[PDB]
Design a protein around this nucleic acid. Structure first.
Ligand SMILES: Nc1nc2c(ncn2[C@@H]2O[C@H](COP(=O)(O)OP(=O)(O)CP(=O)(O)O)[C@@H](O)[C@H]2O)c(=O)[nH]1
Ligand SMILES: *C(=O)[C@@H](N)Cc1ccccc1
Ligand SMILES: [Mg+2]
Ligand SMILES: [Mg+2]
Ligand SMILES: [Mg+2]
Ligand SMILES: [Mg+2]
Ligand SMILES: [Mg+2]
Ligand SMILES: [Mg+2]
Ligand SMILES: [Mg+2]
Ligand SMILES: [Mg+2]
Ligand SMILES: [Mg+2]
Ligand SMILES: [Mg+2]
Ligand SMILES: [Mg+2]
Ligand SMILES: [Mg+2]
Ligand SMILES: [Mg+2]
Ligand SMILES: [Mg+2]
Ligand SMILES: [Mg+2]
Ligand SMILES: [Mg+2]
Ligand SMILES: [Mg+2]
Ligand SMILES: [Mg+2]
Ligand SMILES: [Mg+2]
Ligand SMILES: [Mg+2]
Ligand SMILES: [Mg+2]
Ligand SMILES: [Mg+2]
Ligand SMILES: [Mg+2]
Ligand SMILES: [Mg+2]
Ligand SMILES: [Mg+2]
Ligand SMILES: [Mg+2]
Ligand SMILES: [Mg+2]
Ligand SMILES: [Mg+2]
Ligand SMILES: [Mg+2]
Ligand SMILES: [Mg+2]
Ligand SMILES: [Mg+2]
Ligand SMILES: [Mg+2]
Ligand SMILES: [Mg+2]
Ligand SMILES: [Mg+2]
Ligand SMILES: [Mg+2]
Ligand SMILES: [Mg+2]
Ligand SMILES: [Mg+2]
Ligand SMILES: [Mg+2]
Ligand SMILES: [Mg+2]
Ligand SMILES: [Mg+2]
Ligand SMILES: [Mg+2]
Ligand SMILES: [Mg+2]
Ligand SMILES: [Mg+2]
Ligand SMILES: [Mg+2]
Ligand SMILES: [Mg+2]
Ligand SMILES: [Mg+2]
Ligand SMILES: [Mg+2]
Ligand SMILES: [Mg+2]
Lengths: 61, 82, 392, 205, 85
RNA sequence: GCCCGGAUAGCUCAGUCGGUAGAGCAGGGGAUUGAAAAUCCCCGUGUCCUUGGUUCGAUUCCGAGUCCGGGCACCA
RNA sequence: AAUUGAAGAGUUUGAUCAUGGCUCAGAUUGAACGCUGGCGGCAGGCCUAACACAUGCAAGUCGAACGGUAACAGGAAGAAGCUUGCUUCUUUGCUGACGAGUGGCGGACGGGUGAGUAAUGUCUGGGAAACUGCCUGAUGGAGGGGGAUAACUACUGGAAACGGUAGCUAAUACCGCAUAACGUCGCAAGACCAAAGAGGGGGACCUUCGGGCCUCUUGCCAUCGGAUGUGCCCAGAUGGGAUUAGCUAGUAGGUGGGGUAACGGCUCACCUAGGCGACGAUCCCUAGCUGGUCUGAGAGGAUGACCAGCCACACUGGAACUGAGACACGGUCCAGACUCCUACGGGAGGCAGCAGUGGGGAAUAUUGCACAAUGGGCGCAAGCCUGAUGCAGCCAUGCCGCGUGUAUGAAGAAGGCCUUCGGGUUGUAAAGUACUUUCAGCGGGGAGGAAGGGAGUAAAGUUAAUACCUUUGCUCAUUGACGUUACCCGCAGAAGAAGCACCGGCUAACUCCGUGCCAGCAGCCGCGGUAAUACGGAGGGUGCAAGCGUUAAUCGGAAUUACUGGGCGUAAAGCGCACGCAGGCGGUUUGUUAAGUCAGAUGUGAAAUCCCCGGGCUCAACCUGGGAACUGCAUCUGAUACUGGCAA
C-alpha cells in the first residue's frame, strides 16, 4: 500500500505508477509514497513551491 | 617468450609507455616479469623524460628477450657511449 | 535495405479510392503487373497487397499498403485505400499524401454511398487531380448505360467542384487484365496515359526547414523504430539531428537511416514518401500524429483561430446548428485531435452554411503554424473545413 | 560558480565590511550597514554554537569568493599538510591568483581581480593564466600582460592600493605593473579579524 | 562456423586417420610381447621385444609418443621378462 | 490500426427494455463544546464519462470522441 | 619526510537519574526519479533475463616450402589495321605478383561474461615425483632412395551444402634404409632411436647448356642447459545454519599389473578393515577468490563495479581428436530444446567478441574512424590482418576547472510585500554612465604525439672479391585516425549562459494572507479544531550551485555484539540443584628441552592503489619518478625470564 502526496490526484483502480520508499507515520502499515511527476500519475496542480517534489514543471511564462 | 616492450599507460592524448619485460602471450598492460625503465614521449624540454636501466635489460638479452623495435630504438637514444 | 535508390524520375504520389468491391486492390495488383511489361523489376501480386490475415480471411483491404511502379517518365508511389466507412482513419492518412487519386467506380453499381464520401474527403484534404476508372466493364457491354454511368460519375464530381467533364474516365476490367487478357490489358495502359498526362509534376519546397508528418510507426526486426512519412518541406540526410514534436513531450533523435520501398536512400527530400530510422526511440514513445521536424523550427500548441464552412445535409454536413462547447475532431496532416469550440460573441447557433470563424482549445499539444489548412469531421461525415487564421 | 548578486548584502549579514564593494570609494556608508541583513534584520539572532561556526566559515568564504566544494578541498588540503590546520588553510587562500592581483593592487575588488585574471590579462613568469584558482608558488613574479597593460581599469585601481596595507610577503613594482610574490603569508600578517579556529571546528564534525 | 581456417577441420581429420594407424601398429607390437609373457617364453618374448623396440622408439622421434611413454614401455616390459629370463 | 466490453452524486450500488433520474453510508447547516462524538431541528448535495443527431422528450435509440481493461493485426 | 588522531543532538516523565531502542548531523555510490541546465578536461556507463537474437565485422598470414596462374599488369614470338613500328592483337608462368589447392605457423593469445564452485577454486609459504612451441647458450650432424595425394583433367550425383569413381604431378607433405652419441632401456655387456631444404650474389672451373662448384643468410635434426609458461602435492587461511550428527565401500591403506609428461585408487584383481567427525564431518542455502574499494581514531564492519593477478564457462548435456599447450567463444562428432532454408531427399545456426534489436527492468551508450601510435599473429622484409588498442559519438553519472561580467550609481525611483501607515523592505539591486571580453560564434595561423620504414650513398666487417648480405653514419621524398586538434592571434557585442531545496526544534534563515483536525505536511518529536514562524500562495532570508533535492545502499556516530571497548539483586540477562567426561585454567623447588614468546638475519609480501618529497598537462582532477609501506608468512642462527613438555 502506498501513499499519494499532494492535494488532488487522478489515480483510478489501474494506471501504472512509480513507487519510492518512505513511511508516513500517520497511517499504520503504509511504508511507501507514489512519485508525483513520474509515470501515468500527473503532478500536483498549481504548486509554486517545492516543485521538484510533486512533479510540477516550472511555469512557461 | 619474454619480450622487452612498451606499455601504454597515462591519460587520453597523453601517453606514458613503461618499457617492461613480459611474456609475449599477454596483454599490453597485462602480467609482466619485471618493469625496467620508462619512456615519456611528450615530457617537455626539462630535467627528465626517459630512463632505461641498461644493466637489467642486458641481463635479459643474454637470457633470450626479444626486444621490440620501438624499445631497440630507445637503446640507441640512451647511448652506450654517453 | 540493400540496392541504393537511383534518382532518375519525378516522384508522384497516386492511389486508388472508391466504394468497397469496385476493385481498388485488384487494380493496384493489375497496374504493377501490366507495368512489369514496360518495367523490369516489379509485379506486386494481389496477395502481396492483402497480406494481413484479416485481409486474407475477410477479403477486405483494411491497411493502406504502399506499392510502386513507373512509366519511363515518372515514379509512382501507389497508396491503396480502405473504402469501408468504419475505416476512414486509414483512408484520410492515405489520401493526405494523395497527389491525384485513381477513383475506381464499377459499371455494375455506378456511383455508391462510399464513393460519395471519398470524393468529399478527397476534396476536404485537397486531392487535386482525380483520374477515374470504370472497372467491371467486362460485366456489362450496354454502351448506353455505360455512358449513363459515365454521366452520373461526372455528375458527382460536378457538385464537388472538381472539373468533372474534363476528368479522364477510363473503362476496363481490372480483373481480366490481371491474368493478361491483351484486350483489357490495354485499358490499364490507357489510364497510365492520363496517369502521366492529366497529372503534372507537382511543386515541392525542398529549401524549407525540414518537416515530416508521421503516418505509421514500424518496429524493424533488429534496426529499431522506422517512422514513415512524405516529406512536406525541406530534405533530410542520414545523421541529420531531427527531433519529434507532437502530442506528447518532445524527444530528440537522429536519422540513422533513410529508405524508400526497401531500397536504401542516403538523402530524402520534399514530396518523397520515405521511411526514417531513428536513434533509440522505443515504439510506445513515438506514435502516429506527431510530427518529425528540424530542431526549434516548430513547437506544439493547443490554442488558435480559424474558419468554418458547413455543407448541406443532403451532401453530408449538418442540418441542425450547434451551440458553444461543441467538440468535433480536427484532421490536419495525420491527426484527429478532438477539441472544444470557443465561439465568438452572441453566436448561439452556428447555422450550417456559414463561413464565419471560431476559436479552439483541444486535448493534445500539436505542431501548428498560421496557414495550416485542416478538415473538421464528426459522426461519419465532414462538418467543416478551416485553416489556422491566427495563433491565440 | 561566482556569486554575482547584490554583493553588499553579504557584508550586512556577516556584519563586517568584507571589501566586496571596496572600490574607488574610501568608506561604504551607503548600504544602511550593521542594522539590516534583510526584512527582519532589525532583530537579533539566537546565534547558537553551530551559528557562530557557520558565520565564521561564510565570512572567510565570502571574502575570497570560493564555493563550498572548492572550499572543502582547501581544508582537506590543509588538513593533510604539516603545521597547523587553521593557518595552512589561510595560506592556501592567500596563494590564489585572484587574491594576489587584489593584493598587488592591479584590481580594485577581488571580483575585478577575478575579471582581470579570467580575461587573459594577467601573466606569471611570462605565462598567460586564466584560472583565478591558480596556486602561486613562492618566489614567482606576476604582471599584467603587455596587450591589456594600463587600460583605464588598472591605473585607477593601482592608485587605490596606495590607500591600503600594502602587505609584507609580496613586493610590487607599481610602475612596470609587476608584483613579486615572495615567501608564503604568515598568520600574523594577514586579516586577523577572522578566526581560522572555528573553520576547523566546523569541518571536524 | 565460416572462417577460411576450416582447413584445420579436414587437416586434423586427415591427421587423425594417420596417427591412429601408427598408434594402432604400436599397440599390436606391445600386445605381441604380453602374448609371449602369458606363454612364459623368455626367448619368444625377447624376440618380440627386440622387434618392438625400434617401433616404439621411432614414434618418440615423430613426436607421437612423448618419449617418456615409450621409455616407460621399454622399462616395465624389460622388467617383466628379466624376471622371466 | 482493428474488434469487444465498462464509465449513474464525495464513496458503494439499483434502475432502461424512450416519459422530466434513486437507496444507504458520508458531507454541509443551526444549539451544545475549546473543536468534535452522541442527542435534537434541516438540505441531493448529479455536465447520467464528453459531444452531436433521431424526437415533444434520450440514462434508457443510433453515430464520432476520452480514460481503462481483454483479444488481434502490422514491420522502411 | 612517509596514520599530527577519537565531538554530539532529538525523543519515554509533571520533573530527575539510569537502562533502552528509534531518528538526525558525515562520507561514499556502476546509482534511479523530479525540477533545472552554458562550456571544457579526466574517468565511468546492462547491478535485472547466463533471456531470445535480424545485419555487418571481431584470425589471419608466408610465393624466401611446392605444383600451379584462374584473375591484373609487364616481357616476348607473332598478328592486323594502318600515322611500317602508331597500334590492333592470339599465344606464352618467362618475370612483378596472385585466386583455389597442398604444406608451415597462428588459431589454447588477445576480448567477453560471473552461471557453476564452500573447495577439485583463491591467497600465503614451501616442495618434487614433471613437460615446455616461439626465444637463446654449448656440442655434433644435416648421407642415400621410394610410394602416394590435392589442385588439375574426363564423366557424374546433389536445389544447396557437399561430394563420388578412375587416372596425372610436386614438396620444408609422408614412409623407410645408413648413421649414431655425454640420448633411451639395462646392474653391466650390449640393443636401439633423427633430420629439410630454400634464397641472394658470384671468380676460376664446370655445363647432357636443368645445373654443378665457391660464398653469405636462414630454416631442419640430436643432446644437455637457461628463461617463460603450465601440470601436480602439502600446511595455514578462506560464508551462514546443529530447527543437519553420524558420514563413506574404490570408500582408508597395502601388494602387483596397466595408465599419465609427471606422483597418486588415477584405474583394475587380491589382502587388511579401516578412514573423516564436536579444534563441526556429511547435508542445506548463499557466493567466483585476491591485490584492493567505501567507511573507521584505530581494531574492525560492508564489499569485490572500473584497473590487474588467478579460476570457471562458451545455446544445454557429453566425448574425443589435432597439437608444445584445449579435453577448445568465432573447431569436430553425437543427442536435446528453439529458430531458419528446402526442389521434402537433407541441410544451417549459436552475440556471456564490437556495435545494434526485442524483452525484462527504476535504470545503463554509435549498426562511427583508423590501423598513425603501443601490443599480437604471419612473414627475410616490405607489408597484410587486428571491433586488442588508439580515438570520436551519446548521457551532468561522478570528480575537477571556468563562465553567466566589472566598477560606479540615491530620486536611496517604479512596482511587490510589510506597517505603530511615520516608515521600512527588496536594495547599489535595477536603470543611467565608463570599461572588459574568459568560454561559446566567426575568420586566419598551428605544435606535439613519428619511432621507424623506403630509395641512394660512403665506410667497416664478411668473403676469392671492389659482388651479395650485415652494421654504423649521411642525404632526398615522406608515413596522423583524432583533426574544422591543444594552443596563439584577430572581429563584434553585456552581448548567447541560474536554478534547486529549506526557513517550529534537532539545523543555518521569518512575516502576511487563504484554508479551519478539512485540504495537506512529516527523517524523529509532532503541526492543522477560525490569530498556523510546521498546511497552500506571496514577500523576504538561508544553504548549495550547473547543479539541487528525494528514494535505495554501506560504514560512521552505535561502548546499541563491547578483542581494543559492556553486562546479569530490582531495567533484557545466573541453568531449580548436584555429580561429572571432553575442554579451559592450575600451588611451590631444581635441572633440562626450546613448542609458545623474544631478538637478529635472509627470502618473499607481483604492479597499480593508499601515504611522503618532487615532475608534467595554463591550475585542478588526471598522469607520473623515487621512497616508504604492504602492519603478513616461511626458514635459519641465538636468548631462557614467564607459559608448555619432561624428570625428581
Ligand atoms: N467479374 C469481375 N470481377 C471483378 C472485377 N474486378 C474485381 N472483381 C473481384 O472483386 C473483388 C474485390 O476486390 P478488391 O479489389 O479488394 O476490392 P476493394 O473494392 O478494394 C475492397 P476494400 O473496401 O477493402 O478496399 C475480388 O474478388 C476481385 O477479383 C472485374 O472487372 N470483373
Ligand atoms: C518504406 O518503404 C517507406 N519509404 C514507404 C512505405 C511503404 C509501406 C508502408 C509505409 C511506408
Ligand atoms: Mg482494397
Ligand atoms: Mg466480402
Ligand atoms: Mg455489390
Ligand atoms: Mg563544479
Ligand atoms: Mg511530555
Ligand atoms: Mg549482465
Ligand atoms: Mg547473426
Ligand atoms: Mg595465394
Ligand atoms: Mg583470454
Ligand atoms: Mg545431379
Ligand atoms: Mg618431415
Ligand atoms: Mg646408463
Ligand atoms: Mg632425406
Ligand atoms: Mg608399475
Ligand atoms: Mg594425489
Ligand atoms: Mg601403483
Ligand atoms: Mg553465484
Ligand atoms: Mg561489468
Ligand atoms: Mg577453459
Ligand atoms: Mg558445448
Ligand atoms: Mg544465451
Ligand atoms: Mg577458438
Ligand atoms: Mg560468438
Ligand atoms: Mg553486445
Ligand atoms: Mg537495449
Ligand atoms: Mg519496460
Ligand atoms: Mg578482416
Ligand atoms: Mg514603493
Ligand atoms: Mg573561443
Ligand atoms: Mg621525427
Ligand atoms: Mg608531428
Ligand atoms: Mg628515415
Ligand atoms: Mg535557527
Ligand atoms: Mg514543507
Ligand atoms: Mg491567518
Ligand atoms: Mg508557512
Ligand atoms: Mg561498533
Ligand atoms: Mg545505522
Ligand atoms: Mg549494556
Ligand atoms: Mg528481570
Ligand atoms: Mg540459584
Ligand atoms: Mg581435566
Ligand atoms: Mg621458536
Ligand atoms: Mg620472529
Ligand atoms: Mg604493491
Ligand atoms: Mg605542477
Ligand atoms: Mg621498501
Ligand atoms: Mg617449567
Amino acid at each position: 500500500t502506498s501513499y499519494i502526496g499532494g492535494e488532488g490526484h487522478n489515480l483510478q483502480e489501474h494506471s501504472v505508477i512509480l513507487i519510492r520508499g518512505g513511511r508516513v507515520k500517520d497511517l499504520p502499515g503504509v511504508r511507501y509514497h507514489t512519485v508525483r511527476g513520474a509515470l501515468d500519475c500527473s503532478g500536483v496542480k498549481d504548486r509554486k513551491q517545492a516543485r521538484s517534489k510533486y512533479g510540477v514543471k516550472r511555469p512557461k511564462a | 617468450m619474454v619480450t622487452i616492450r612498451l606499455a601504454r599507460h597515462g591519460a587520453k592524448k597523453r601517453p606514458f609507455y613503461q618499457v617492461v619485460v613480459a611474456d609475449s602471450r599477454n596483454a599490453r598492460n597485462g602480467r609482466f616479469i619485471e618493469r625496467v625503465g620508462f619512456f615519456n614521449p611528450i615530457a617537455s624540454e626539462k630535467e627528465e623524460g626517459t630512463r632505461l636501466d641498461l644493466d637489467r635489460i642486458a641481463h635479459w638479452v643474454g637470457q633470450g628477450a626479444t626486444i621490440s623495435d620501438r624499445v631497440a630504438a630507445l637503446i640507441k637514444e640512451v647511448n652506450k657511449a654517453a | 535495405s540493400k540496392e541504393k535508390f537511383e534518382r532518375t524520375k519525378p516522384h508522384v504520389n497516386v492511389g486508388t479510392i472508391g466504394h468497397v468491391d469496385h476493385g481498388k486492390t485488384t487494380l493496384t495488383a493489375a497496374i504493377t503487373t501490366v507495368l512489369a511489361k514496360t518495367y523490369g523489376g516489379a509485379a506486386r501480386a494481389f496477395d502481396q497487397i492483402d497480406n494481413a490475415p484479416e485481409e486474407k480471411a475477410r477479403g477486405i483491404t483494411i491497411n493502406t499498403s504502399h506499392v510502386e511502379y513507373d512509366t519511363p517518365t515518372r515514379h509512382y508511389a501507389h497508396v491503396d485505400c480502405p473504402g469501408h466507412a468504419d475505416y476512414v482513419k486509414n483512408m484520410i492518412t492515405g489520401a493526405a499524401q494523395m497527389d491525384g487519386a485513381i477513383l475506381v467506380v464499377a459499371a455494375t453499381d455506378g456511383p455508391m454511398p462510399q464513393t460519395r464520401e471519398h470524393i468529399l474527403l478527397g476534396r476536404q484534404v485537397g486531392v487535386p487531380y482525380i483520374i477515374v476508372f470504370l472497372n467491371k466493364c467486362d460485366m456489362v457491354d450496354d454502351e448506353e448505360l455505360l455512358e449513363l454511368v459515365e454521366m452520373e460519375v461526372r455528375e458527382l464530381l460536378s457538385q464537388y467542384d472538381f472539373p468533372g467533364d474534363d476528368t479522364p474516365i477510363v473503362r476496363g476490367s481490372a480483373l481480366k487484365a490481371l491474368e493478361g487478357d491483351a484486350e483489357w490489358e490495354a485499358k490499364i495502359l490507357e489510364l497510365a496515359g492520363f496517369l502521366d498526362s492529366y497529372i503534372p509534376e507537382p511543386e515541392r519546397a525542398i529549401d524549407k526547414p525540414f518537416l515530416l508528418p508521421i503516418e505509421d510507426v514500424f518496429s524493424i526486426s533488429g534496426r529499431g523504430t522506422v517512422v514513415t512519412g512524405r516529406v512536406e518541406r525541406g530534405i533530410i540526410k542520414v545523421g541529420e539531428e531531427v527531433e519529434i514534436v507532437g502530442i506528447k513531450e518532445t524527444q530528440k533523435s537522429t536519422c540513422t537511416g533513410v529508405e524508400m520501398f526497401r531500397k536504401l536512400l542516403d538523402e530524402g527530400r520534399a514530396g518523397e514518401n520515405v521511411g526514417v530510422l531513428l536513434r533509440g526511440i522505443k515504439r510506445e514513445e513515438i506514435e502516429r500524429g506527431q510530427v518529425l521536424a528540424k530542431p526549434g523550427t516548430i513547437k506544439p500548441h493547443t490554442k488558435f483561430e480559424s474558419e468554418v464552412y458547413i455543407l448541406s445535409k443532403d451532401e453530408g454536413g449538418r442540418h441542425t446548428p450547434f451551440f458553444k462547447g461543441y467538440r468535433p475532431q480536427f484532421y490536419f496532416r495525420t491527426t484527429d485531435v478532438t477539441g472544444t469550440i470557443e465561439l465568438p460573441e452572441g453566436v448561439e447557433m452556428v447555422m450550417p452554411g456559414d463561413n464565419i470563424k471560431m476559436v479552439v482549445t483541444l486535448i493534445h499539444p500539436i505542431a501548428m503554424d498560421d496557414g495550416l489548412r485542416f478538415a473538421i469531421r464528426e459522426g461519419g461525415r465532414t462538418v467543416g473545413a478551416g485553416v489556422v487564421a491566427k495563433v491565440l | 560558480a561566482r556569486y554575482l548578486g547584490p554583493k553588499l548584502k553579504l557584508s550586512r549579514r556577516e556584519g563586517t565590511d568584507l571589501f566586496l564593494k571596496s572600490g574607488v570609494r574610501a568608506i561604504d556608508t551607503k548600504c544602511k550597514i550593521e542594522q539590516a541583513p534583510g526584512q527582519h534584520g532589525a532583530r537579533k539572532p539566537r546565534l547558537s554554537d553551530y551559528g557562530v561556526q557557520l558565520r565564521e566559515k561564510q565570512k572567510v568564504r565570502r571574502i575570497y569568493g570560493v564555493l563550498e566544494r572548492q572550499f572543502r578541498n582547501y581544508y582537506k588540503e590543509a588538513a593533510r599538510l604539516k603545521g597547523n590546520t587553521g593557518e595552512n588553510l589561510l595560506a592556501l587562500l592567500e596563494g590564489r591568483l585572484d587574491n594576489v592581483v587584489y593584493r598587488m593592487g592591479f584590481g580594485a575588488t577581488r571580483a575585478e581581480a577575478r575579471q582581470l585574471v579570467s580575461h587573459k590579462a594577467i601573466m606569471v613568469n611570462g605565462r598567460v593564466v586564466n584560472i583565478a584558482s591558480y596556486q602561486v608558488s613562492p618566489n614567482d613574479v606576476v604582471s599584467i600582460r603587455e596587450k591589456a597593460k594600463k587600460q583605464s581599469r588598472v591605473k585607477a585601481a593601482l592608485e587605490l592600493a596606495e590607500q591600503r596595507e600594502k602587505p609584507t610577503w609580496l613586493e610590487v613594482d607599481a610602475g612596470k605593473m609587476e608584483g613579486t610574490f615572495k615567501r608564503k603569508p604568515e598568520r600574523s600578517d594577514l586579516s586577523a579579524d577572522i578566526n581560522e579556529h572555528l573553520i576547523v571546528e566546523l569541518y571536524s564534525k | 562456423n565460416i572462417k577460411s581456417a576450416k582447413k584445420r577441420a579436414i587437416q586434423s581429420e586427415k591427421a587423425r586417420k594417420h596417427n591412429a594407424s601408427r598408434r594402432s601398429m604400436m599397440r599390436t607390437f606391445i600386445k605381441k610381447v604380453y602374448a609371449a609373457i602369458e606363454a612364459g617364453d623368455k626367448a619368444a618374448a625377447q624376440k618380440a621385444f627386440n622387434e618392438m623396440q625400434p617401433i616404439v622408439d621411432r614414434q618418440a622421434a615423430k613426436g607421437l609418443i612423448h618419449k617418456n611413454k615409450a621409455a616407460r614401455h621399454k622399462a616395465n616390459l624389460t622388467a617383466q621378462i628379466n624376471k622371466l629370463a
